[PDB]
Symmetry: C4
Subunit: 259 residues, 4 copies
């Protein structure tokens, strides 16, 4: 039952000192990979003979490749040990966290098999952001993250209905604004999907101002949309407040009953 010991170490890093040191090393490497990508996209200066500035990941391509190789070796050995200590392979690999880890470390190997044809571009780069979600597994102890997470899980039904009604209101307001503003000169309301942008920006009280109503009817319906946006801001708060109070008191009561 030593594999069970390894899996216990993985699930609860505070059990053994080796578990804690491995968990901290893994968190450090995840943070290093996240910062490495963010910095890699940053455009550094131009070396002599270069017309345009290059990103720190295109000038220092080999250094960032070595760093990514180190991070992916750490992550791969992590996943291999986790699968080896999994009481059930199917049960483990179907969990959301295993999927996140696999899709995080997959674009590296996808690029590896595309190394011979690296001239072509791939969208797999944007999948590296999945490593950021591993940070969340590294920080599941704040005594309030559990409360807020389970509060959102309780709110799921109400917030889903709110999202559905908000989507229907977006369709309605976008239709109204498109038909009010399709006839303006150089108008940005070229269709109802084009007005989806204006409506989602207005009902959230963003107001970029790139799409604004130029007409009078457009302005009337934009005012109605603005007020509906105030209501949109104010609507989830009572639900989350009630569920959070209930869940806080429920967790406290269970704890002190156990106390």
């Amino acid at each position: 039952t030593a594999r069970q010991r390894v899996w216990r170490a993985f699930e609860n890093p505070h059990t053994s000192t080796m578990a804690l040191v491995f968990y901290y090393v893994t968190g450090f490497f995840i943070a290093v990979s996240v910062i490495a990508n963010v910095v890699e996209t940053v455009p550094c200066g131009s070396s002599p003979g270069h017309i345009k500035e290059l990103p720190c990941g295109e000038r220092y391509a080999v250094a960032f490749f070595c760093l990514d190789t180190a991070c992916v070796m750490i992550f791969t050995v992590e996943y291999l040990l986790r699968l080896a200590a999994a009481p059930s392979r199917y049960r483990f690999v179907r969990s959301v966290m295993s999927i996140i880890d696999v899709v995080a470390i997959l674009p590296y190997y996808i690029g590896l098999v595309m190394t011979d044809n690296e001239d072509v571009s791939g969208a797999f780069v944007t999948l590296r952001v999945f490593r950021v979600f591993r940070i969340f597994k590294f920080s599941r102890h704040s005594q309030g993250l559990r409360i807020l997470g389970y509060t959102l899980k309780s709110c799921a039904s109400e917030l889903g209905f709110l999202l559905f009604s908000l989507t229907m209101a977006i369709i309605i307001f976008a239709t109204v604004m498109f038909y009010a503003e399709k006839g303006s000169s150089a108008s940005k309301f070229t269709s109802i999907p084009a007005a989806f942008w204006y409506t989602i920006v207005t009902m959230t009280t963003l107001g970029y101002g790139d799409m604004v109503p130029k007409t009078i009817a457009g302005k009337i319906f934009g005012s109605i949309c603005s007020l509906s946006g105030v209501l949109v801001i104010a609507l989830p708060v009572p639900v989350i407040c009630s569920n959070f109070s209930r869940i806080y008191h429920q967790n406290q009561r269970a704890d002190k009953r156990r106390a």
Copy 2:
């Protein structure tokens, strides 16, 4: 009392299997019509010999007409059966839902009688958005939609007073901003109705930025308006929170008293 059976099927689709299948077919056709309009407004490419791009409903005019004909036949037979199974014709037709359905399927026939003179344009197209409201009748079971709806109905008086006071504050701030900014060069505050737009955009914390105060007094009063907008955002939340908590506990208490 078979008409009563049909009306029972219409009111509660989960009673019979035929009622459920008809209800699902109706929901599918409503969703198809909504998506059909939204896509119809989308501008597709230009066929050879066409200078300007055409909407998917102007290039594929006949296909979208056939789809609309199918949807309107479904909706018309729905309404005819609903009126035939109505215990009272006047009571049914005066309900808001019958009015919504009638005004949703009316522009189709209005266009039909205007087919001979289809060259002229009509605003009836924008009334097709009423079909979107039928989605709401198709989704009246989420266990929280009833709670939030009846909470808003309870809040009606307070939220109406808040809307009235917000309207009066809009008039006041628009007057002040117009008189502060009427004298600027190329000013957009050409009148007090023109400043209604600036005030309704500022008090909702939108800030498009198309109308901004150029003067110093205009900026002082815009700052006061911004703070009033913070208050506007924060004011309905306590009312909705209190009413929602009360209504949640009331429904729960009634249910468990019946339990």
Copy 3:
């Protein structure tokens, strides 16, 4: 004690039928004056021989003068009767409502004494907006306006502290942004008062975008300001919620104890 009867009619319009009809006439004339000013600022078309469009109050100057004369005669006779039925003249005239009425009907007479020299302009026009506040006395019965008003009166101390801390934070953030952005090219942060505008627009989650940080330090401090603005939006809500719940239950308990 007939003057007491008149004052009772004024204070409670529902006592006598004559009181109710006079109160409704007064409300109608107040609304007419408000709409008259708002429409007066609206620019109508240009008559032949006029280069520029004129406001409806500059083209129809005599008609709007007659309407204003009617409204001000009604308001003056109202105030004269109110002072005649006042149990104490000093006590009545020192009330905020008497001051509002006097400053609302004063610019009319100020213009009258300036009729001979009407060529010069005066700011007294913007004081006509005070008549809008009389609407509030005309609508002091909604069963929730009293609750929210007395809730705000209870919150006065906390909301005053919040306004003070918000002002200090505005000074701090404006200083930081000015010193971060004073050196940019064609910068709008020409001083710390100039950055008061940016800070009051950012901390309220308005974001007009007319003043945005162009630098990197400016963007860092603008991000801190944005988060502080989220906190500003979220801070008065708990206070207003707690006070509103307390005041609602207090009024209900007092009423049912009297019931």
Copy 4:
């Protein structure tokens, strides 16, 4: 134990009349310094022979230097007396308020030692804003400031987790938006740090509009970001509400138990 008397006067200004008058003098001088800096940055007119307008602190340089000298002498003698009456020198100087006062009055002496080389510029000017924080020590009695401050201290853990999750969401959304919009023409999403600005402006419902998505995928992810911003606005409110209610009732119960 007379030094103890002096320190008691400093800690509680309402004890003696001399303590109260010194405390009010100190508050007056702090406010004078704050207003003096804010006005000093303001650009006044140009005297003859001056091409460009000068700030009130560059034209009236000697007057503002004299005012700053007076304020700094007051603050220095304040700090000297506070250290002389401190029961423990190390304990006093390590408090946050002593640090704030020292860093507030330090740039004055830093400029003094740089008077001979005043041609070079220094960032120490922006540190004068620390004097603003002394206002907060001058206004620690409103009966609600303590409640809100200790409520925020109680919320510290939850709000820290919320800030951490918001930072991770900012990284995720910035990565997605950068990869969606890096390829646009004249795009402002030149890197992931460049999209940190767009994400922090969108998730706070600011919407300056300087950086807006030009693409379709960029607009989809901007809509997701806008909705996440609505959630960001609505998330701290339940936490602050619950903690504020608890802390209000706790302080009230302790007070009336002592009553």
